[PDB]
Each structure stands twice: as C-alpha cells, then as structure tokens.
Amino acid sequence: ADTEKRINVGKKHLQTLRNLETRCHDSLQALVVIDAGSSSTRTNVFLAKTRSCPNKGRSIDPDSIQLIGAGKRFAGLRVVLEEWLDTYAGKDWESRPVDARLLFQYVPQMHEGAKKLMQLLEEDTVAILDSQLNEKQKVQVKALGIPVMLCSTAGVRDFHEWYRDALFVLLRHLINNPSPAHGYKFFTNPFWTRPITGAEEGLFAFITLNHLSRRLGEDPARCMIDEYGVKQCRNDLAGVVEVGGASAQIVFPLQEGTVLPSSVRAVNLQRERLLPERYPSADVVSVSFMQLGMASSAGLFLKELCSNDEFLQGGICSNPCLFKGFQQSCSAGEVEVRPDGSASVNEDVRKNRLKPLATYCSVNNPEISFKVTNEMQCRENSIDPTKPLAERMKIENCSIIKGTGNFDKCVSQVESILVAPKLPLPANIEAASSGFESVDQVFRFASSTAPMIVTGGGMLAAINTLKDHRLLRSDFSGDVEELAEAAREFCSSEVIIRTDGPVIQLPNARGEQKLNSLNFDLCKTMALTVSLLRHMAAGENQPSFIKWEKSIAGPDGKPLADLGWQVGVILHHVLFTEEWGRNAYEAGYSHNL
Amino acid sequence: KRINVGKKHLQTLRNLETRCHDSLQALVVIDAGSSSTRTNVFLAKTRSCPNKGRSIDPDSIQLIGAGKRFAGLRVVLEEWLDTYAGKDWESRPVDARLLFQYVPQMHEGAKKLMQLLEEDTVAILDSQLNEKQKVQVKALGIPVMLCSTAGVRDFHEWYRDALFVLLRHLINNPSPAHGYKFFTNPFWTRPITGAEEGLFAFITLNHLSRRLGEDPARCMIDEYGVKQCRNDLAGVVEVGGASAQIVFPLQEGTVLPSSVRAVNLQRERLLPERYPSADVVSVSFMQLGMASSAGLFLKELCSNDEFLQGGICSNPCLFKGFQQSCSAGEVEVRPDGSASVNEDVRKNRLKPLATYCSVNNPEISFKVTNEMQCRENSIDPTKPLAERMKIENCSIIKGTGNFDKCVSQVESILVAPKLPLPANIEAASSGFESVDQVFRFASSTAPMIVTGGGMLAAINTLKDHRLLRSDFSGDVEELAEAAREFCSSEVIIRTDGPVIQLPNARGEQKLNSLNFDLCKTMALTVSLLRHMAAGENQPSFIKWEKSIAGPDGKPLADLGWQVGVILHHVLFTEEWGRNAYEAGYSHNLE
Amino acid sequence: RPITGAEEGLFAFITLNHLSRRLGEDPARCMIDEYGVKQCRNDLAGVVEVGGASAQIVFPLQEGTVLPSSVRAVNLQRERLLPERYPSADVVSVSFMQLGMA
Numbered sequence A: 001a002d003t004e005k006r007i008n009v010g011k012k013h014l015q016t017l018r019n020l021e022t023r024c025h026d027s028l029q030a031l032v033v034i035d036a037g038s039s040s041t042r043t044n045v046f047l048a049k050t051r052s053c054p055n056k057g058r059s060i061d062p063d064s065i066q067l068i069g070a071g072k073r074f075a076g077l078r079v080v081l082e083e084w085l086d087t088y089a090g091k092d093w094e095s096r097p098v099d100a101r102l103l104f105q106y107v108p109q110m111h112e113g114a115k116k117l118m119q120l121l122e123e124d125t126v127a128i129l130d131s132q133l134n135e136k137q138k139v140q141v142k143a144l145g146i147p148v149m150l151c152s153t154a155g156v157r158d159f160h161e162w163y164r165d166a167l168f169v170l171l172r173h174l175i176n177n178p179s180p181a182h183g184y185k186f187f188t189n190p191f192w193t194r195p196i197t198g199a200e201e202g203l204f205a206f207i208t209l210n211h212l213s214r215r216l217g218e219d220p221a222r223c224m225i226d227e228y229g230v231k232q233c234r235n236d237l238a239g240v241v242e243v244g245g246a247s248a249q250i251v252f253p254l255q256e257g258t259v260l261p262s263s264v265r266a267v268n269l270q271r272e273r274l275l276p277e278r279y280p281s282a283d284v285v286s287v288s289f290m291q292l293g294m295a296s297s298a299g300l301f302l303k304e305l306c307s308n309d310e311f312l313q314g315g316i317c318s319n320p321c322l323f324k325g326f327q328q329s330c331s332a333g334e335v336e337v338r339p340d341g342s343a344s345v346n347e348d349v350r351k352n353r354l355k356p357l358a359t360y361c362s363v364n365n366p367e368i369s370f371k372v373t374n375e376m377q378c379r380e381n382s383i384d385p386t387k388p389l390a391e392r393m394k395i396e397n398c399s400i401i402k403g404t405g406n407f408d409k410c411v412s413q414v415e416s417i418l419v420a421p422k423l424p425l426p427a428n429i430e431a432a433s434s435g436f437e438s439v440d441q442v443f444r445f446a447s448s449t450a451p452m453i454v455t456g457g458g459m460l461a462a463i464n465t466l467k468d469h470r471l472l473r474s475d476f477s478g479d480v481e482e483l484a485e486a487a488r489e490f491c492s493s494e495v496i497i498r499t500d501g502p503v504i505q506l507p508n509a510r511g512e513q514k515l516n517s518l519n520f521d522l523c524k525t526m527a528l529t530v531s532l533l534r535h536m537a538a539g540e541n542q543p544s545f546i547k548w549e550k551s552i553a554g555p556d557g558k559p560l561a562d563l564g565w566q567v568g569v570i571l572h573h574v575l576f577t578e579e580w581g582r583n584a585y586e587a588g589y590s591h592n593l
Numbered sequence B: 001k002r003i004n005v006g007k008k009h010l011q012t013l014r015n016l017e018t019r020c021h022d023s024l025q026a027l028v029v030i031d032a033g034s035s036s037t038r039t040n041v042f043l044a045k046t047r048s049c050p051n052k053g054r055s056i057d058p059d060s061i062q063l064i065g066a067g068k069r070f071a072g073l074r075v076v077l078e079e080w081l082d083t084y085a086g087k088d089w090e091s092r093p094v095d096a097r098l099l100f101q102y103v104p105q106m107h108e109g110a111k112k113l114m115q116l117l118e119e120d121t122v123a124i125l126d127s128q129l130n131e132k133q134k135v136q137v138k139a140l141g142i143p144v145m146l147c148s149t150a151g152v153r154d155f156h157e158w159y160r161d162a163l164f165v166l167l168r169h170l171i172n173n174p175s176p177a178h179g180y181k182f183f184t185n186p187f188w189t190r191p192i193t194g195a196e197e198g199l200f201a202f203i204t205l206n207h208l209s210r211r212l213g214e215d216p217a218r219c220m221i222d223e224y225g226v227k228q229c230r231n232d233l234a235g236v237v238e239v240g241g242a243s244a245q246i247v248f249p250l251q252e253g254t255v256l257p258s259s260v261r262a263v264n265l266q267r268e269r270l271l272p273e274r275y276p277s278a279d280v281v282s283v284s285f286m287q288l289g290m291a292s293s294a295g296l297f298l299k300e301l302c303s304n305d306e307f308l309q310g311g312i313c314s315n316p317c318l319f320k321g322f323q324q325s326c327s328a329g330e331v332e333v334r335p336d337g338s339a340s341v342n343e344d345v346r347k348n349r350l351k352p353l354a355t356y357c358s359v360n361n362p363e364i365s366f367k368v369t370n371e372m373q374c375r376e377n378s379i380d381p382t383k384p385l386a387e388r389m390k391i392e393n394c395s396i397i398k399g400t401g402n403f404d405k406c407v408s409q410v411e412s413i414l415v416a417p418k419l420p421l422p423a424n425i426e427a428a429s430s431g432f433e434s435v436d437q438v439f440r441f442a443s444s445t446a447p448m449i450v451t452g453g454g455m456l457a458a459i460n461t462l463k464d465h466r467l468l469r470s471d472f473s474g475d476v477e478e479l480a481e482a483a484r485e486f487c488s489s490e491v492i493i494r495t496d497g498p499v500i501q502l503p504n505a506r507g508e509q510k511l512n513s514l515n516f517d518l519c520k521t522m523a524l525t526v527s528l529l530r531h532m533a534a535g536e537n538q539p540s541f542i543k544w545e546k547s548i549a550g551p552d553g554k555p556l557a558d559l560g561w562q563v564g565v566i567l568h569h570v571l572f573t574e575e576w577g578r579n580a581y582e583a584g585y586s587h588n589l590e
Numbered sequence C: 001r002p003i004t005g006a007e008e009g010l011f012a013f014i015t016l017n018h019l020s021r022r023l024g025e026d027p028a029r030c031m032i033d034e035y036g037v038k039q040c041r042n043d044l045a046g047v048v049e050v051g052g053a054s055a056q057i058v059f060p061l062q063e064g065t066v067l068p069s070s071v072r073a074v075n076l077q078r079e080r081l082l083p084e085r086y087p088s089a090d091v092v093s094v095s096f097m098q099l100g101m102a
C-alpha cells in the first residue's frame, strides 16, 4: 500500500501551488541612462531584478543593478541647439545679439533636430538590448516597461534663454513616443529626464562609488551615543575625486565631530532626497570646481600662463607643461596633433576651451554686475567682461606656444593658476554644494580620514603612463615625491618625428610612445595630481588611503557597472520604494496611452 | 505672429507631462452561486497622476455585460466525489485523506468550467469594446474577482480551499491568443459568507444610488466639540436562492440590545476612513432563501395536524388543482400538467439546512441550544440524513389556494417562529435570530429596496395581470388583495400544458417549475411589509428594484454583491495600486 | 470610570504579564509567515482570576489556529490596551458572572 506515497504527492502539489500564490516573484527589468555630456550623447543600458510581493507592490533589488551596454558616442545636445541657431538665428548668433522671442516660430524645426538624435539613441539602445538579452529575458523586459533617465551634464547649461528647457520638453516627448515595431516600452518623465549640475554629478558619483564598493547599505558600519543619549549610526564611506571634461568634483564624508564654519554646510543626502531614511545618515563635503575640468583647466591655464611676463617673450609663450619640441598656435582652441608632427588649432569660437568660462564672465548676463569681486576675478584672468567674446578668449601679444618640458615650473603654475588662485571663482551655494571656493579651503577647514578614490580617464592616464614606462611602480599608493620624480623624467621628453608619426621620446633611452591629441598636454594633469595630493597631505586629517580606480570589481570579480554618475541617478529614484512603485509601475508606459 | 503657435505648442506639451492621464480598465467579477457560475464584465476609468500613481474613479464603475449561466462550482466537487469517494458520499462517512491522490482530476473538472467562463468574458469584451478601448483595456491588465457564495460552504474538508487554489491558478494562466491580461490573487478570489453578500449588496445599492460618498449628509457635535458624521444611506432586502439578507443603517441616536451588535463598515475594512462612519443592522437567514424556505415550509407545514390528514398534506400556498408527491425534493412541472419530484438527496431543498443541522457540524456543537433549535424546527441532527429530511405519514401535497392561511403559516414557520433556527454570529452579521426581532427591536426610518429574482417576479406577476397598479409603492392591503385574488386561481390541464386560470376569467398564465409555489413569495412579501409597518420607525419609502440607472438615465449596473466587492478593493487606493498595477499580471511571468 | 468583568480580565492579564517580565517590546519568538513576513509575539501567560462577582479567563490564542466564526480573538492593540510598539497580542477573553465567589 504505497497509497501513502501518492497522498503526499497530492498534499505537496497543493503546498507548491499555495507557496506560489503567497511568495514574492522575481522579474527582470531594463533601465536606460542617457549620458548627455558636453561633446557627446551616449546610451547606457542597465538590468535590475524586480521583486513583486503580495500586498506590497513591486520593487528593485538595488544590488542587482548591472550595466549591459554603453552605446555609440553621438553628437552632444549642444550641437542640436547650435545647428538650430545656425539655420534660424543665423551663423552669427555666437557674437551678434539675438531676439529670442522670434525663435518661437522654429519650435517644430528644433523638434526635428532633436528627433534625428533621439532616433539614433533609440536605435542604438534597441541594438544593445537585442544583442545582450535571451528570448526569456526579452519577454520580462518588454512586459515591465523601460524607464529612461536622460541627464545633461555640461554644454547645454550655457545658452541662457528659453531654448534649453524647451529642448527638454521635446526630448521627453520623443522618449515617450518610441516606435512600436521593436516592442521595448521606453518611457520617461520630468523627474527622470532633466539637466544636472556639476555639484549634483559629484553626489551621484559618490553614491555610485559607495554602492559598487558595498560601503553604502541599510545596515550601519558603526554606531555611537551622542550628548543627549540617542544612538547615531553611519556607514564607512569612501570619498571621490572625479575629474571630468567640464569640472572636477570632490565629495567625501564629513569628519565625525567636525563643526563647519557657518558659511559652508554639509550636504545631507537624506535631506536632499538622494538616500531614503532607512539608510544611515550621510553628511558630506560636496565641491564642484568649474576651472578644474580637463577642457576648462586647459583653456584657463593658457590664458593665464601666456599673459605672464616670465613665460611670454616676443610673441612666444614658453609652456612648462608641454614637451620640448612641441609647438602650437597661441590660443585656447581645440588641438589636433597631425601625423605630420605639427599641431592644428581649431580657431572656431564653438571649439574654444575658454568658451564656458568666457560666457560665464560677461557684462550682458550674470553675477558680474552683482558682486564686485566677480568682475574682479574675470579681469585677473585677462577676460574683461566688457569686451566681445573673441577678444575675451584671445591670448594677446602671443603668436606661438613652445613646450619647455619643465615639470616643477608646470606644478608651480598649476598651483598658482588653477588650484590656489589669488582670487577664487564665486562659491556655488546650490543645495548639492557645500559652498567652498577653493581646494585649500576644503583641506584646511574640512579634511577627513575617509579613504579617497581618484577617478576620470585623464587622471588614470597620468598614472598609467608613468607605470607603463616603469617610472612609477605598480604598487604606487599616492606618495607625492614618488609621483613628482616620475613625472619630472617623463615630462622632460622630446617630441621626435618618425615615419609612423610623432613620438614622445623619453630621456636616457627609456623608450617612447606616439604623440597624440589626447596625450600632448598630459603633464598638466600629472601636475594637477601632484598639487591635489600636496593639499590633501597638508590636511589636519589624512585619508586612510588613496587609490586610482576606473572600475570596481563585483562579487564574481567582474565589474557590475562603471564609475560615474549613472548608477547614483538610478539609485536616487529606485531606493524610494513607494515613489518608484507609483512612477515606474502604476503610471508606467500606460501613462502615454 | 507664428511665435504664439510655438509658445502654445510648448505649453500644451508641458501640460501633457504635468497633468493626470485617463485610461480605461476592465474588471471581472465571477459570481459562483449554488446553481450557477456567471461572469460579470465591468468598465472603469483609471487616472494616472505624476508622483501619485494610478487609481480608479469609483463613480465610473459600469456593467458592460453579464454572461451565460454555467454549472455551479458544487458540481465540480460532487462529480469528483462521486468518482473518487463513491456514490454514497453524502450519506456515508468518507476518509478525506485518501482524496489527496486525486488533485489533478479535481483540477481537470475546474479547468473545463474556467475555459467556458474565460471564452464568455472575452466574447463580452470583444462585443462591447471599440478598437481604441481594446488597446487601453489590454494594456492595463484585467483584475478577476471570483467569489463563491452558497453551494461550497458546506463540504467541511480540505476540498473547498484546495479548489480555490486551483481556480486562481487557472485564472492566472489565460490564453495568450486573445491579448486580455486576466489575473487574480487570494484577496480577490475567495468564498464569501451570506452575511458578507449582504454588506456588499448594501455597498452596491448605496454607491449606485449616490448615497455613499465622502461628503456627509448630516453631523452631530459630541461633548468634546468633535463632528460625528453620517451619509443618508438606504437599506436592502435581498432574497436569493440560498439565503435572504437584510442590511440597513442603524437608527440614529440608538444603541441596540447588548446581546446583538451593529456592524461597522470601516471597522470591517470594507470602506476606507475617508467615508463617513457606517453602522448597520446586518442579517443573513439561510431559511429565507427561495430554495431553503420552500423545503422548510413543507417540512413544518406537512408535520402539523391542521394540514396533514389521511396522508394528505393540504398546502394553502399551492394552487387548487395542484398536486405533488410528499417530499421537499425539487419539483419539475411536466408538459402533461403533473409534478415530478426528484427524490435524490442531492436535489432535496432541505439538504443545506440538513447539513447545518448535523452532529458532524461543529457549529451546533459550540452552542448547546443549537441542536434543540434544529430539532424543534423538524430538522433533527440525531437522525441520519435521509430520515432527517423525510416528511412522515404523507403521500400527497394538495394545493388549497388560501392566501391568508398561507401568510399565517409563513409567519409561524419563516418570519416569527416560536423557536427560530440558530442565529448566525459572524464578524459580518449582527446576531439577530428572526425578522420579527429585527423590526420589533431595531427598526429604522431609512428607505428600503427589495431585491431578488423571485421577489420582483411576484410583484411583476400581479402588475402584468393588472391586480396591482403600476405605481404600487408598498401598501400591505393593496398587495394582500392582489395576491389573494391571484392565489385563488385554479390549475387547469390543457392540450398545450398546465395553466393558472385567474378567477372571473380575468386571465391566465402557463404553470411551470419556477412559478407553481410563487404564492409563498407573495405571502413572505406581505408578512415582511406587515413587520416593517408595525415597527416603531418605518422606512421613509419602499421600492422593488433590479438595477440603478446612471446620471444619463442609461443602466449603470445591477443590484447585488458584485459592485460592492469591486469597491472594497478599489477604494483602498494604495493597496489597489500595488496589487493591480505594481504586481499586476506581470506577477505571473514564468 | 466603571469597568466591566471582561475589561477587568484584560487588565489582570496585562498585570500578570508585565510583572512576570513576559510583556515587553522584546518578543520571545518571531515566526516567518506564509508571505515571508516575521510576526513577533511575547510568550504571554494566561490568567484565571476568580473574584466575588465573576471569574475571568484570559489567555493568548493558540498559534496558527482558526477560532469558530461565532467567537472572536480580542486584539489588545485594536482595543487600545497595548501600544503598536508592543508585539501583537490576540487573546481568548471570557468573564463569567455565575463563577464569582458570591
């Protein structure tokens, strides 16, 4: 009588079915972050595990977030508006005054320009999904809808009329109207698709760093009892130094028991709605330096160095940050190292590395008339706001720039021009910003023992180049003198012209590498790094360690996602359970019909 | 200037991304009653708002189609038991544990019924929706709420709960071919008690008639200056096949006897807190359903010396010329005029009362008086099932068509019994024992709506023969006069079948299985109205209704428990949004 | 204010459980339910209190049991006898006027 066996099969069958209707169900979801930078617009495709629980709705497991594809670098959002202003306002718009009111006639023409770009991003996104997902995964991803987060960093923020915000209204209309033939349910809203500031970018990069490295989590790393008797809990978070194209961000946890001066403030991630209340309280020093971006620092450096009598003689600017044998036209225009060995300087106003700073330093537009010191800071850098744009960016009494390959002079000038200028640029007081004005002020008044991660392609190139030539050891841990001695050797290299093109030839027959558009001025980045490390060493509190990272390894050893602001943007929406459930699932793609 | 066209274009696009968006949703209510299972298709307007999710506008709930009557859920279980337990399962002890060997066979029975219901639901959606409505309806998902009422309540083993697990599984796997995303969960698809049916019917009535809303009709200030607000709700009298429900608002400024309780809709999680407090008198009587009252009426009338003489039971609620064999078995009026009484234990009208009034049932074991209340109503729990339902010393039931004698027997057997059947005590009920007690001790001024197929057929029959005026508004003597005349009709056999021939040659109608015992319903109506009239407080008005017309005069939905079941879910905004939209049909992926 | 026999039983049950250190914010055991939600309870002791006018019997409802629909579990949080921070307490509460000493 194996009747008992077949009774239990029936009992277990019913239990299996009961468990299935009472337990949580997992489903895969795709998430898209469109990185709309200054000179490019690129799609970023993510996957996440959603959990659907009886009477609780649907949520994302934040630890499941993973990048499955980075797309093609298309034209920057700036290009859409520049071309629209070239056709309808006249190619003369960058110099001549334009009545913005008249441009409302060309709204569907602006819509068409943005449509071209959005179709290309949509095409590229669909391509990445189709190539990375199996048929089962595609069924889950197509049914759930695909939230889209388009965020413009730099480039677009520089227009100062109605165009910018109107463009955003148009991009969202295009995102919410995808072609039905592919079946991917792309959608957005004004909370997910919007421009972000340099300061907000830093906070997102801080969140990304801390999530990927698993330092950020609901469970506190350490708790402490305050003066009143209430338990105060925190995570052991790492700080971040992110050097981008248009700005550099420095975001790190506020030192425990530190009281900042009244004029500056710790940015509280819970108060700013970047982290939910269920996460340990996070108070950070947040700083975004507009003159410390790869592009903006290059422009300002030339403007200031080449207006200094020690460096400028008879129309020749002797640049200590450029290699011996290198020469270029005297301007902050975009440099192309030609196979010939020579340098081509793009003289277009649109391609000038000083353009963001020179538009910021004008009589016609901002803070210049407001605070006397603001106009005083522009004139100091030989950019008088009363002059037209071309004249403001022009390096006067200067014809050529010759490299002298003197690292110590390069460090001294980076210190004097970019890191500790006599008159800092106005302090930014937005919610995302602590309100600091210089690097010294940060490390003099608000230094911390939290570890620091150095990020940005240019920063990592500076270190890796020295390691590649065996000037820096692979175990390099951030010692200043070690870096300075390594860079002093590399930076004294000669530009040699060979049949295969120009080369950076190292002293004492150490070797060579090809000279190119990306590496010709990298000694300025090595000098910036030396200067940052010195200011960090001079702090009362020292970071427990300093590391240079491009990626953070995951549980399997493979990076789950890349460093930057993208992960942080997903998290600040996704971690707010109720609001995310309402927007992504209740409203969803069905909100578009 | 073409600039204003551009400025308007951006402002309209901006409004489009800041404003709420409306979208249509279909909702399904499967009514799994004792004799039948029928789908009910509804339409609703959803509103999607930035940072606020998606909700249903309750005023938009509209019935678009009520489908076919398929077999009762009870048939699934009876057939599976006849096969796997044996033909004598209703009368012999069964080892329920051995039946765990036949779970796929139970699933197989449920699957045939679910496929028929699914196909019918889809046919209704396809016949009522335009191509644009279909797009919206298909996108949002289709919540399904299967609720069983009578029929499955009395099995008392693991079977019913197991059947429900299988039904939700079937609902959660619809045919992908039609594009309709049907889905359910254990909160939507579940059995409901008779007292719960009453509360949902009371909610349906008050919602459709626009009495139930967030804004109160009247308030009273308490000792602490706090407003104690209420709506002006109507009560309901619902006579179904298996039970009769009475639900009405508790008379204002009153407190019930301490041994009974007012049912609070907000406390019972039926209405959200944003709705004024609704305290109700809630009553469900198994013995007052069409099928059960018919069985018990015969059981008690045919055991009384005044009616039973020489093996002949003289029934005053039956027509002169009508005759049937002595049993509470289902009556089939045959073409030849004769009555065919089904002797099957399964077809006995007394079977649900016999199941309640059994030693097996723990319900009669909790309370000591319960067994006595059963026995004194001629349903002896000590007797075996067949003996328990049998009418002794009786061969024939003869109709006498005496309406007043019928009313007086309805009073003594059904409305005001000397000793009622055990009172129903559950979270959804007040604990009253009889109709007489309801109106003697807890009468209200609230208007009353009389509903149910049989109740309305009884009023319509008298109106169609022009015995009652069309504008009849509930007068007891007008009703008793019309019913008295109709109930004195003679049953005549004709070549075309049996007819009810009205006196003074004032008409005729076909005699059938559905209308032969209709005079008992008329007597129940007179008896109920007499009790409501004698109350300290009388309803402001009394109406017989089947549906409530919308603001456009067009029919909005039907009266009954279905709309109320939808509301007790949709009105809890956050819970609804999570269940219908966040989890949705996508919860069934893989 | 006056209190009834049934309220007196609930009050006596709370007294006993507080004094014996059974009632408190710290649950004695927490059970992961069918949905995967941990449901915390104190290990409460029942009371038989025989007074002059009535006898009260109050004890926690058996874990995973379904009472007949004709009777109900008294929830202390719902009756505002215990705050929300205290683990949920469902009791069988009875007061018999005929079991008192007098």
Ligand SMILES: Nc1ncnc2c1ncn2[C@@H]1O[C@H](COP(=O)(O)O)[C@@H](O)[C@H]1O
Pocket: A243, A244, A245, A246, A294, A295, A455, A456, A457, A458, A459, A461, A518, A519
């Ligand atoms: N290998 C590299 N050498 C020099 N500059 C780079 C390199 N990779 C990226 N950059 C620059 O560093 C900045 C940040 O780059 P990324 O971290 O790749 O977004 C931009 O101005 C890039 O053009």
Ligand SMILES: Nc1ncnc2c1ncn2[C@@H]1O[C@H](COP(=O)(O)O)[C@@H](O)[C@H]1O
Pocket: B239, B240, B241, B242, B290, B291, B452, B453, B454, B455, B457, B514, B515
């Ligand atoms: N036209 C009718 N004539 C007589 N009895 C009816 C009629 N319609 C329904 N009934 C009875 O009323 C009960 C409830 O019907 P309903 O409201 O349609 O569920 C049924 O179970 C039948 O016993």
